[PDB]
């Protein structure tokens, strides 16, 4: 069945940066349109970046636009978020995370998720 | 701005039910795709269901099917979870959800979140 394993994350101070991986298997990340979504406590769900299935064009949420980039390797199929310029404010737990109707499979998957944090 | 406002939540006890509301400001329910999404205590999100499509066809957790309803009343642009047969397993903070796509690919959306505790 399908599955989406999230690493990377962890602990940093601002200006850092952090890349997280997620490792699909049981489909192709190519095939899907997939994400990531954040989650604070107070600021609920959040998508923080997209990429949509074929021509490989890219949503970002306004607050991360220049410093996070979402992108694939096909033959790993690994979906990533390169984390650049961190500020306190992104500290969330991050879902790799198919769109609410993917593909394939009738309801919507989630990674299990990755704390990212970010303080002096 | 699109908006989704959750209410309808709080404690029951287990055997009982409890409808989820999701007012939808800024766009219409009726077209668009939707959805809810549920964290337990400690664990991760998880799809609980959606409705979507051109014929309003509705999809559910393995876990909640036969228990849970989604619906949408479109007078009152208003999502709903009608939640019977309620578990310890339901215990969990609920965000509405939908995905709109005014440019050929889907843009997505979450409420606040409204805790449900089942004891």
Excluded: H
């Excluded at 923080?48 to 790993?76: C, E, L, M, Q």
Aim: proline letters at 4%; charged letters at 20%.
């Amino acid at each position: 069945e399908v599955q989406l394993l999230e690493s990377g994350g962890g602990l940093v101070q601002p200006g850092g940066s952090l890349r997280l991986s997620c490792a699909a298997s049981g489909f192709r990340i190519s095939d899907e349109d997939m994400g990531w979504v954040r989650q604070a406590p107070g600021k609920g769900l959040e998508w923080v970046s997209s990429i949509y299935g074929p021509s490989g064009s890219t949503y970002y949420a306004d607050s991360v636009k220049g410093r996070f980039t979402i992108s694939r390797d096909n033959s790993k199929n690994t979906l990533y978020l390169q984390m650049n310029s961190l500020r306190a404010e992104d500290t969330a737990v991050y879902y790799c995370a198919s769109a609410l109707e993917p593909l394939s499979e009738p309801l919507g998957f989630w990674g299990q998720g990755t704390l990212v944090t970010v303080s002096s």
